[PDB]
Design a protein around this motif. Structure first.
Motif, short mmCIF file in Angstrom:
data_model
loop_
_atom_site.label_atom_id
_atom_site.label_comp_id
_atom_site.label_asym_id
_atom_site.label_seq_id
_atom_site.Cartn_x
_atom_site.Cartn_y
_atom_site.Cartn_z
N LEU A 45 36.21 38.00 46.97
CA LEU A 45 37.35 37.92 47.87
C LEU A 45 38.52 37.18 47.23
N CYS A 103 36.78 49.72 52.46
CA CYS A 103 37.59 49.88 51.25
C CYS A 103 36.92 50.68 50.13
N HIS A 120 35.32 30.37 54.80
CA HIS A 120 36.14 30.35 56.00
C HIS A 120 35.29 30.37 57.27
N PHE A 235 48.97 29.60 46.53
CA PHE A 235 48.53 28.86 47.71
C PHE A 235 48.55 27.35 47.46
#
Ligand SMILES: C=C1/C(=C\C=C(/CCC)c2cccc(CCCCCC(C)(C)O)c2)C[C@@H](O)C[C@@H]1O
Ligand SMILES: C=C1/C(=C\C=C(/CCC)c2cccc(CCCCCC(C)(C)O)c2)C[C@@H](O)C[C@@H]1O
Lengths: 239, 9, 239, 9
Positions: A45, A103, A120, A235
């Motif tokens: 990811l 995907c 997360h 980020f």
């Protein structure tokens, strides 16, 4: 009434830009670190998001007006809005049928639990999926989807932006295009524009929640070492 | 921001 | 004559450490960004080397005496010697038959040209293979192979080292073990120890040449973004 | 050297 030439070529170059930076076959995913199902999904990811950051930069570079901004403002807009553009563009692979991102095959079918294995939590993921369902239910045109991302990109209320007048101007011209498109070319879109603007507000709180959990992730070296240089830079908190 | 700068040409 | 207990348990814990940090099946390679045959091989070989850095740290942590050093010296030794330990350990997969590194299947069979597609040149690669052939021709014991890596790790002539007396001492004790092993347990090893020490000198010039080409690679953002945080940190110039 | 420090425990 109808759209002007200028509004038309803004739409044209925007749709063309999304096509040049979004692959519906998702064929580049085999180049990522493969998915694994502690934080087994993080490498994949992270590779996925990094790849997506690159595509977002490509799109932004073709948004009429963006290239004329200072490099600083270009970065400041890109840094703050990136994850929201990712969330926005990712709707194209989201399916209401299985509440997941499909995907290419079963390896690249991503459910909520996969992101959990990326560091997360449900505090991010349940408003995330909530957001994806509402957005998908709008059944946007390709013109509206592409305008929305460009609206979001050129938001003047970001940390670090300097020329908040010039950026608000570009965004306003983009918004004019959208309002006009829905009115003229979208039947029964009497309320759609309002709903879309609301979706931008949702992204802000989604952005905030991700930034919190990412900051947690990035402070732990054993996890931050699984990220990519690009992800860390975009980020990251450097000025 | 070396990477971003390069990517933005 | 014969080896003492202390020299024996140094050998034992070293061989055990290499076994714990080297997988002869190379099964973790499927977790890397897949190989591609501009600089198509860089993502895979960067993932490969990063993985290897981690394994080298594991090995070093078990070298008797290393753990007692300051964290600074531990880093300084690890930073300077890493690529040489990589070159040393990689001999285990090198084959004289096809002049390549065979690591599981045909995807992970690496010839010289593959490394060329990682941003490196023949100025590094031809002394590299030259080094690998000579080392393989020594037909080292597992004890000698593992001692050599530990000798190299504890070299006191590295940039950044502080306690050059304590590090020279550990290396000397390790060298004593090696000299003794060859004499007692290696028939016809009358000259082997000298040849091995020479192999350390070769690594120094191999290290230098790699550091030059890596510095070239790392200065270009489009290439440095394909590296990993660990690689960037270990081969990077920060103090 | 945050990574290296962590890896060295
Ligand atoms: C990135 C894309 C896709 C899915 C995106 C998704 C859906 C899940 C794959 C997503 C998007 C934004 C945020 C999140 C939450 C996780 C944050 C990223 C992880 C890090 C960077 C470590 O914080 C998931 C898949 C395709 O639609 C392409 C699209 O660009
Ligand atoms: C790393 C290992 C293996 C092969 C190593 C090899 C042989 C080729 C795969 C190698 C080793 C050292 C240096 C080089 C030259 C390229 C430098 C690395 C690339 C960067 C970091 C971008 O500069 C190749 C394969 C196995 O033997 C495991 C071993 O740990």
């Amino acid at each position: 009434h109808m759209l002007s030439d200028e509004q038309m070529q803004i739409i044209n170059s925007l749709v063309e830009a999304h096509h040049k930076t979004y692959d519906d076959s998702y064929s580049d995913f085999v180049r990522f670190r493969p998915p694994v199902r502690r934080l087994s999904m993080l490498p994949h990811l992270a590779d996925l998001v990094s790849y997506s950051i690159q595509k977002v930069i490509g799109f932004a570079k073709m948004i009429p007006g963006f290239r004329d901004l200072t490099a600083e403002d270009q970065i400041a807009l890109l840094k703050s809005s990136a994850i929201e553009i990712i969330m926005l563009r990712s709707n194209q692979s989201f399916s209401l049928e299985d509440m997941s991102w499909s995907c290419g095959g079963p390896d690249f079918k991503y459910c909520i639990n996969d992101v959990t294995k990326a560091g997360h939590t449900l505090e991010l993921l349940e408003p995330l999926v909530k957001f994806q369902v509402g957005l998908k239910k709008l059944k946007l045109h390709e013109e509206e989807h592409v305008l929305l991302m460009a609206i979001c990109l050129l938001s003047p209320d970001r940390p670090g932006v300097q020329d908040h007048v010039r950026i608000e101007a570009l965004q306003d011209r983009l918004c004019d295009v959208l309002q006009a498109y829905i009115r003229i070319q979208h039947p029964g879109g009497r309320l759609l524009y309002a709903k879309m603007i609301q979706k931008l507000a949702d992204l802000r709180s989604l952005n905030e929640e991700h930034s919190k959990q990412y900051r947690s992730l990035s402070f732990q070296p054993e996890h931050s070492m699984q990220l990519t240089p690009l992800v860390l830079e975009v980020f990251g908190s450097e000025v | 921001h070396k990477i971003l700068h390069r990517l933005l040409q």
